[PDB]
């Protein structure tokens, strides 16, 4: 079972990162009753024990989902302690070691990932994701003053944001989903794109400049999809055929 082999590799990486100096503050969940403001600042807590339990629950079908959770450990420290705090440097040392090990094992990992999810090896899936990513970076992120939508809102800077927006979405998260080949057609991609606009309508109001910008992001997305419609339609058909064949 390739998911088991993959999981054993990921756990070994966790063992190696746990062994780096001064990493103990990251080995187990923050005690939110001692660090009493922690959840007022941090939205996505993560630690090496939770990461290991997620590996054991087989939640990670590839390098990328594992690494995204690992990176939260660094981002949370950067937000809570500060970008240059020793705790943030320590957590960065674990992400760096992870990246070394992932590089050393990349061919074995690619093979496991493809055995777990054959679409990661499908040339039509790959081409489709490449086009979506270029639409995001060259068209949607190029909309003037689109910076509020480039990354997740940091609750440190907008403290009530996630009390209002319980289904957040942003363009970086979409790019990560594209890199994971989450989208097999333009409809699921557009579900996420439109969630960005819906969240701005809900949080900022229909007439806010934030919402006008988000509306422009969605509109140039539709315009660019229309320009590539016939290629995208062929790719979506061939992906559906590949998806059905993996059965
Ligand atoms: C103007 C506020 C205050 O100044 C500090 C940052 N800033 C801000 N706002 C949003 C945002 C997005 C959508 N709708 C919103 N409504 C109100 C704010 C808001 C996003 C972001 C970032 S970030 C720094 N990762 O948090 C880039 C994602 N920063």
From Swiss-Prot:
The Bromo domain mediates interaction with histones that have acetylated lysine residues at specific positions. The second domain also recognizes and binds histones that are butyrylated and crotonylated. It is linked to Dystonia 3, torsion, X-linked: An X-linked dystonia-parkinsonism disorder. Dystonia is defined by the presence of sustained involuntary muscle contractions, often leading to abnormal postures. DYT3 is characterized by severe progressive torsion dystonia followed by parkinsonism. It has a well-defined pathology of extensive neuronal loss and mosaic gliosis in the striatum (caudate nucleus and putamen) which appears to resemble that in Huntington disease. Intellectual developmental disorder, X-linked, syndromic 33: A syndrome characterized by intellectual deficit, delayed psychomotor development, delayed speech and language, and characteristic facial features. It is found in: Nucleus. Phosphorylated by casein kinase II in vitro. Belongs to the TAF1 family. The TFIID basal transcription factor complex plays a major role in the initiation of RNA polymerase II (Pol II)-dependent transcription. TFIID recognizes and binds promoters with or without a TATA box via its subunit TBP, a TATA-box-binding protein, and promotes assembly of the pre-initiation complex (PIC). The TFIID complex consists of TBP and TBP-associated factors (TAFs), including TAF1, TAF2, TAF3, TAF4, TAF5, TAF6, TAF7, TAF8, TAF9, TAF10, TAF11, TAF12 and TAF13. TAF1 is the largest component and core scaffold of the TFIID complex, involved in nucleating complex assembly. Coiled coil: none annotated. Component of the TFIID basal transcription factor complex, composed of TATA-box-binding protein TBP, and a number of TBP-associated factors (TAFs), including TAF1, TAF2, TAF3, TAF4, TAF5, TAF6, TAF7, TAF8, TAF9, TAF10, TAF11, TAF12 and TAF13. Interacts with TAF7; the interaction is direct. TAF1, when part of the TFIID complex, interacts with C-terminus of TP53. This is Transcription initiation factor TFIID subunit 1. Residues 1-247 are annotated as: Interaction with ASF1A and ASF1B. Residues 1-105, 119-228 form the Bromo domain.
